[PDB]
Design a protein around this ligand. Structure first.
Ligand SMILES: Cn1cc([C@H]2C[C@H](O)[C@@H](CO)O2)c(=O)[nH]c1=O
Ligand SMILES: Cn1cc([C@H]2C[C@H](O)[C@@H](CO)O2)c(=O)[nH]c1=O
Ligand SMILES: Cn1cc([C@H]2C[C@H](O)[C@@H](CO)O2)c(=O)[nH]c1=O
Ligand SMILES: Cn1cc([C@H]2C[C@H](O)[C@@H](CO)O2)c(=O)[nH]c1=O
Ligand SMILES: Cn1cc([C@H]2C[C@H](O)[C@@H](CO)O2)c(=O)[nH]c1=O
Ligand SMILES: Cn1cc([C@H]2C[C@H](O)[C@@H](CO)O2)c(=O)[nH]c1=O
Lengths: 156, 156, 156, 156, 156, 156
């Protein structure tokens, strides 16, 4: 069997965009992941518009509503909630999605870049996760048998 | 009638600490809020110890589990979810809590310092919110008749 | 004690409008209801405008989004879900709201005009309901001790 | 992959029964739908009894309980919540199911007959839906990649 | 303020019946509890009949459905979920109710007779609980500020 | 298609361990069950430690937290909630899981040993189940088409 995922990753910093590409690649190689039918936010912004790339939409209530709902749909409609996590650059949006994933009863997996693994993460992100792994463990992670595990690291 | 709230507010930067004090003062003046029976995270960390004062707790699963659970209990047993929000220093912890509050069906009110009201806020925060007001309106906000409203500002 | 309610009632036919007035009168006489702090949809449409008075809003996503959200907020922040129900003119809107109220764990009480009490009602409405009474009992219903009961009538 | 659905459709009017057959046919041709393991209410009424066809059961608390629970099970147990929607003949039962589907975190798709598409629909039905399409779009709808979209029509 | 509770307690053994009486007495002395408006299962079985007094009801789906539903309604409309717990005679019914209370976001408090406080309790009960105290503390417990705490005892 | 299950069964009595093995066998033969990717508690106790087999962990807050969370994850992450039920030896832990399964929107199937089928079961276990079958019906049960059905037996 294969599972689909909601690709929860930011795209506002160099460290973030770096991890984004890495995780994308790991997923592309993982056998247990049906990446084709997965939902990736950046490719599903309303009307293909990226607001950081079109500041005129910074006040469009309809663009916001549509994108927000689309993201939520991407979460409840897929199997796993994957969060690309950067300890030094924690994203509020990802946080909200972790909480929403919890409500939807999804498996919450946080993936931290190998160089950052161990650094302290926020108490809530730690508590809402079902497991926290390193980037290098992503390609071989068996999504058909998701298990609970503690983050081998600090939590502030 | 009077409502109780969960005081969602970070205390990791000076801007956050300033907003924290202002909000606490506004709430003490609000006739519709019962602050004594509300839940304030900072006075509810497990064993009464803050990890930033006692770094030895950065690696203590028991401390993390209890504090996380106590916070969740603070949201679910209280009427309103209050989030002191600083646009330029958004908190992943507050984000997770907004999602969790949504799952529990609580009114989610964001309060932004007057000087920052209007600056862009994360889409996901705008989405979960039932309303977003400025710090100065907090002391007068009627929590017995909470209603929905859009942020009179930008959202990235 | 006193409870607050969400006034679920259509206003699209004369029978509905008649039932609407009767229920509002019964509620004003109920000592266990706090009507001032309750949510009445008709006084809460976005921007205070009813689409039947201003048809131009029939095509306004912003109006639709805000009004829909405000209604949901009205159900989740109030104690009881009241549904004025007319067996011969059942409302799809009221139906959706019953389902939503169930999801929020609210007591769902249907109130049917005396003259119609007994006529067949949709299975799904009978199912979500915690009790169904006639209009005449509304003024005396004790909302501080709501209990479950079967419709003394038919269900198609 | 293929998805299963809860066939939410009324059967109380000529327009309704017409759309029912049409949608059934569209689903029968859609590649992304596993119609065999889907749940269709009319074939799952308790003991095969249709109350509109056996008025003696109009007062059977056990028949109602069983059918109501069976329908709910049909919803939470399947992937997509499909609602066959007739603007001029909105069903309260379908409404309740849309709300229940929301709580269950299912994708809510409303399908309106091509001749009716555009006509005004109830505010709540509009707001609970993840997407609203035309009958003709049903056969080709890709259920493995469900996305959010606004109804190109009026909402009262 | 005062809170209402759902009195979760078995009455199938002498130890249970003893604990039942002690807890009821402690609750009558608690200034933060409104016992009149609370829900006591034993006074809420359908038609007022207990199946152990009228065994003929052991085979009556209607009795079972109404009593089950009334109990659920008792949990969802009340503030606190109280579970009188006897470690050596754990109740499957109370267990299901703890899970249900968790789903409704209620504070779950277990109360164990002093003589038994400390004995091993089922993992799942320890997990859902927000706190577990001994019978003697019940009369003084402040239900207006419920907080999380670990069982000072064993868990098998 | 095939479905996965959360194997909910006790292991504290001879009758329990007997049914456990039986059900295991039935599942091993059932075509509609993907037993390999299913979650079975006994093989997923934290660190492979069984506390009944290592009483030193009877006070390990970390072992309890981890196992409890792992079990919950096993429930929300799988399709069906299967409960091996012994009428004379009802388990509180299984009860809590039935309630949690309900919240997660899973199909709840109780399987009773053929020799015990008919004996009275707790009102709540009866009410939370979507269907109750005999051990002998397990091997042939079609999990791709789960339907609702009443327990042909007594409920106390
Ligand atoms: C700010 N922002 C955020 C999101 C969602 C997507 C991502 O998982 C996370 C990044 O903050 O939130 C989005 O889709 N669009 C956008 O403009
Ligand atoms: C990081 N962190 C966070 C919280 C909670 C509280 C506040 O709402 C928000 C701040 O991130 O989350 C807490 O209780 N303890 C902690 O150490
Ligand atoms: C169609 N419609 C419906 C509602 C809500 C309110 C009432 O409970 C019920 C009537 O359908 O749903 C509303 O607020 N506005 C609107 O225009
Ligand atoms: C009135 N009624 C209704 C239903 C369900 C099924 C359908 O999706 C919708 C039609 O109202 O509700 C049912 O199964 N039986 C019945 O008698
Ligand atoms: C077996 N049983 C059980 C209950 C409820 C009530 C109590 O919280 C707990 C006792 O099992 O579950 C009840 O109302 N009636 C009944 O006959
Ligand atoms: C007491 N106990 C219980 C459980 C779970 C697992 C099973 O479905 C049910 C048995 O009580 O609860 C567990 O995993 N470990 C344990 O020690």
């Amino acid at each position: 069997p294969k599972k689909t995922i909601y690709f929860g990753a930011g795209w506002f910093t160099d460290r973030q965009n770096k991890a984004y590409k890495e995780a994308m690649e790991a997923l592309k190689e993982n056998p247990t992941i049906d990446l084709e039918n997965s939902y990736v936010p950046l490719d599903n912004q309303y009307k293909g518009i990226r607001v950081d790339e079109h500041p005129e939409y910074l006040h469009d209530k309809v663009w916001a509503t549509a994108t927000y709902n689309n993201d939520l749909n991407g979460i409840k409609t897929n199997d796993i909630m994957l969060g690309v996590y950067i300890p030094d650059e924690e994203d509020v949006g990802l946080g909200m999605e972790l909480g929403y994933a919890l409500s939807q009863g999804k498996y919450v997996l946080l993936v931290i870049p190998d160089e950052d693994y161990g650094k302290p993460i926020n108490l809530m992100s730690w508590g809402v996760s079902d497991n926290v792994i390193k980037m290098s463990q992503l390609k071989d992670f068996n999504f058909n048998k998701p298990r609970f595990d503690f983050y081998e690291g600090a939590v502030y």
